[PDB]
Design a binder for this molecule. Structure first.
Ligand code: PRO
Ligand code: PRO
Ligand SMILES: [Mn+2]
Ligand SMILES: [Mn+2]
Ligand SMILES: [Mn+2]
Ligand SMILES: [Mn+2]
Ligand SMILES: [O-]
Ligand SMILES: [O-]
Lengths: 465, 473
């Protein structure tokens, strides 16, 4: 069948991927006791937007649920799926003559059917008539709460939808659950996005020179991903530690570069930390290797059945052990964990689902509660791991004055801290190591492939090989 | 005073630039007979947005009127200007501690932006109440390129004030139409970097490359060497294969192609908009040279004719006449050029407007103020302004010749036009492609200043693509 492709060495993505997703969604809905026979899923795609009141276009990126279901790149579309049969219909805008003049040929419905391998194509202004003729029991529309943004998903609407029975509660948890588990075809794309972003991270490490501006490396990263990967979008706003990051990379700095390209709306999210000048100091090596250790410990321990908060607390324990070894901390690490001391140095969650969104959906379905403790409350899922899930593993150690100050004021934590040693690490900066992995039947598969050991990084930055 | 700067070789932009804009706006409003004493301008800055319902951030770019007045890069702000004194107050978000996981003081923002006062956003009603203004002047009006209505500032409690939303928009638009010398320094810089990027594209292009490889290179040059985080507009190198101009242009560049790259970077929310046309393989064919030099001729004729008092639609018509003359000299057209012009035949080859205001927006504001009417003729109806030129305006000059099948076929089906076309010669230019030459210029007291600096003659272009140092001529 047909595929998405940007030529050269970019990945060919079969439109069969989205067909499989639709089938999987229907299979799930059919098992839902509340789903009436003759139901039709109705999804509305994204539309082109402009900057404020200007005619300056904003780069269009498809809505994620709609992309997952259809892979459609064009703005202004809808898509529906007959639950009982799986039949898919794409609705495309009916375009005017001036479109031929100003922005190219006007394609038939037949063109779109062939391109997207859907069962039928119609125009958007006919959607009420087409759905009416098919006489559905109910329309299943998308409405739910994203547990990372707090935003409510926007339900599809069209002229005449008021004439239909609409249910907006059933679909969201079911399509979210499908997205949580990646198909082999989806994993191929996420392997590819990780490949290109990994390569771009290597180029950044080779290119960094003291005196450069961070945004120069952000630029290089995006250029590598676009020109070699066909990755037009960054998955997220690029974080370039050491809205352009115009900090000058200084001798002695620890760099932290958190960046990931997106291919055909499939994300990647990778973080590398390394010394700006290519040589770890003793202190930098100590902190860096602590995070390397927790990174590897978590990846190693991950398998179906593991509770993700246990992995977070595993990383905490290891960080505290290493910080104690360094002399920053003293006393019982058991006692330290009881006092939540780990969250002083790692305030964010250990890692998150990744897929079509960087912070992918489904981390907190009904029945899965957020843990109200420091560190853990910032976890973007408290689920147990299962095969097919894609996660970031991103422990880090940070020296954040206001977290440190709070701990030093609190007698339950202040005891553990050696102020004379900690003083040396004020303004140390921060280390984060972020890998993308997939859960397998027995463990994980690592998607990311960048230099990680002190030896590998120093050799890479020195221009070796 | 303070300046915006991204280090290295990037331009230092004094925050005085925005203080001068605030001053000019107040001076205009003071002379406006309908403005009450004690009036206060209230502008609302943009807020951060996310992709749909996700927490994926969209890169924040300040709203243009708010930028023009304040130069503030942070989301979530408001800005107020007391008309009678010119006193400026920035309102900034009160950030929680979790943001530290550094938070700047109000004093830090006051120093950074060289405003008279800074307050937190949640205090705006209290602060304005205490200042006892007569009326709040807010922004509402119609953008004549998008058709959209400018968003009027609002805050909890604004209902307790008298609000006028009609005075400000035409006045602040008119201020934006006329660029200050400080604004011109930024536009010179954006044009310099974008011109250099266009040269790098011409130097790098190889048969067999995808167009988006060149778009990527352009963006990388502008960002890494110019600090231009944003393209000014969606960069044109596909709408066809993926539905939006923003999608990657994934056509493979072929031998014999004519390339058209329309791209321009933005620095600190000041735009550029440049188009270069050139042969993919670095050598103009006789036909390519002919079409190209026709557009070069119209480009230069217009630039040579522009000065204060010139009616912009007359420049569009002048380009039309030159295109038709040259197309006739090529044997694509035959007959009376005067007759062709009467038949609006120029619009067959150049369906768009000759050029447009440029500033903080690529298609900048103020092209159609009250009393200035859109001309309902082919080509001219697409002009983004029908104003007379005055010193301080910044315009693009972007004539082009296109061979667009359905426009040509329509002309061939029209008895009023069909005779002018020689199919025997025209047939050879089907699939020729497109030439557009787009310069950015400033209207001076007596003519123009050219901001753009790219190779333009056939020899200059061929030299650039052959890797000659820019100094070579
Ligand atoms: O948002 C998150 O969960 C991770 C940790 C900080 C950067 N990204
Ligand atoms: O929109 C405009 O005015 C011009 C026409 C060609 C592309 N940009
Ligand atoms: Mn990250
Ligand atoms: Mn992440
Ligand atoms: Mn242009
Ligand atoms: Mn233009
Ligand atoms: O991350
Ligand atoms: O343009």
């Amino acid at each position: 069948g047909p595929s998405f492709w940007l030529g050269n060495e970019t990945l060919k993505v079969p439109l069969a991927l989205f067909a499989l997703n639709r089938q999987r969604l229907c299979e799930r809905l059919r098992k839902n006791p509340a789903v009436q026979a003759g139901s039709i899923v109705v999804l509305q795609g994204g539309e082109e937007t402009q900057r404020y009141c200007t005619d300056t276009g904003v780069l269009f990126r498809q809505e994620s649920f709609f992309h997952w279901a259809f892979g459609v790149t064009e703005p202004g579309c809808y898509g529906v799926i007959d639950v009982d049969t799986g039949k898919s219909t794409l609705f495309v805008p009916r375009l005017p003559a001036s479109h031929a003049t100003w922005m190219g040929k006007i394609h038939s419905k037949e063109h779109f059917k062939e391109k997207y391998a859907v069962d039928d194509v119609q125009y958007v202004d006919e959607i009420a008539s087409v759905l009416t003729s098919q006489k559905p029991s109910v329309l299943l529309t998308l409405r739910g709460v994203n547990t990372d943004s707090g935003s409510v998903c926007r339900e599809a609407s069209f002229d005449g939808i008021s004439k239909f029975e609409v249910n907006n509660t059933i679909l969201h948890p079911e399509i979210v659950e499908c997205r949580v588990f990646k198909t082999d075809m989806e994993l191929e794309v996420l392997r590819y996005t990780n490949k290109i972003s990994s390569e771009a991270h290597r180029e950044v490490m080779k290119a960094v020179k003291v005196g450069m501006k961070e945004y120069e490396l952000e630029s290089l990263f995006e250029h590598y991903c676009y020109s070699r990967g066909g990755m037009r979008h960054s998955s997220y706003t690029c974080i370039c530690g050491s809205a352009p990051n115009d900090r000058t990379i200084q001798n002695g700095d620890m760099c932290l570069f958190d960046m990931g390209g997106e291919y055909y709306c499939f994300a990647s999210d990778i973080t590398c930390s390394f010394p700006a000048n290519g040589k770890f100091t003793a202190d930098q090596k100590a902190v860096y290797e602590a995070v390397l250790r927790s990174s590897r410990a978590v990846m190693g321990a991950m398998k179906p059945g593991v509770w993700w908060p246990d992995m977070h607390r595993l990383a905490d324990r290891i960080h505290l052990e290493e910080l104690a070894h360094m002399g920053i901390l003293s006393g019982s690490v058991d006692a330290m964990v009881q006092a939540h001391l780990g969250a002083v140095f790692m305030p964010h969650g250990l890692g998150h689902f990744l897929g079509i969104d960087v912070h992918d959906v489904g981390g907190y379905p009904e029945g899965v509660e957020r843990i109200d403790e420091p560190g853990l409350r910032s976890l973007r899922t408290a689920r147990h791991l299962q095969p097919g899930m894609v996660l970031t593993v991103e422990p880090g150690i940070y020296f954040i004055d206001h977290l440190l100050d709070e701990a030093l004021a609190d007698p339950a934590r202040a005891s553990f801290l050696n102020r004379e040693v900690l003083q040396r690490f004020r303004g140390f900066g921060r280390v984060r190591i972020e890998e993308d992995v997939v859960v397998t039947d027995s463990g994980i598969e690592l998607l990311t492939c960048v230099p990680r050991t002190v030896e590998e990084i120093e050799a890479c930055m020195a221009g070796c090989d």
